[PDB]
């Protein structure tokens, strides 16, 4: 399966957002992160990806396709706008085994609130 996520200056949950903020995918699925507005990228958050998965970081303005394989939660951010809360979550599979470890990760406050909301939306 193939998915799109937009990086936007504004959307449903306000300013500086990933839309959708959460996505539940299967191993081998692909996500294309599209900065439909200028000035955004996608980067894995430290401490918020499954053991073994590969960290990534796109270029600003790049439509960036990533394939997800290792099960669990993946926290992502927009590098320049992380402090503004510009984050999202991709979750591979139900019952993510790294949930405990990723809830322990430190994020700036607005990012943490939006990551907590995303993780709840994913059923956790």
78 is known to lie in a ligand binding site: yes
Pick the closest to residue 115 from 70, 48, 55 (CA basis).
48
Q: What minimum distance in Å lies between the beta carbon of 27 and Cu ion?
A: 28
Which residues inside 2-41 make contact with Cu ion, applying CB under 5 A?
40
Residue number with the smallest Cβ distance to Cu ion: 78
Residue 31 · residue 5 · CB < 8 Å: yes
**Helix, strand, coil abundance in the chain, percent, nearest 5:** 20, 35, 45
Residue span 77-116 as binding mask against Cu ion, x where in contact by CB under 5 A, dash where not:
-x--x----x------------------------------
86 is known to lie in a ligand binding site: yes
Which residues inside 48-77 make contact with Cu ion, applying CB under 5 A?
none
Residue 42 · residue 8 · CB < 8 Å: no
Nearest-Å Rg of the Cα atoms of the chain is: 13
81 is known to lie in a ligand binding site: yes
Chain positions contacting Cu ion, by CB under 5 A: 40, 78, 81, 86
Which residues contribute to the annotated binding site?
40, 78, 81, 86
């Amino acid at each position: 399966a193939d998915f799109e996520v937009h990086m936007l200056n504004k959307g449903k949950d306000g300013a500086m957002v990933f839309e959708p903020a959460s996505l539940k995918v299967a191993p081998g699925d692909t996500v294309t992160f599209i900065p439909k507005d200028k000035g955004h990228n996608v980067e894995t958050i430290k401490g918020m990806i499954p053991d073994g998965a590969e960290a990534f970081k796109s270029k600003i303005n790049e439509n960036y396709k990533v394939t997800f394989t290792a099960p669990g939660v993946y926290g992502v951010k927009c590098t320049p706008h992380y402090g503004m809360g510009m984050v999202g979550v991709v979750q591979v599979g139900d019952a993510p085994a790294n949930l405990e470890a990723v809830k322990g990760a430190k994020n700036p406050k607005k990012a943490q609130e939006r990551l907590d909301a995303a993780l709840a939306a994913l059923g956790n």
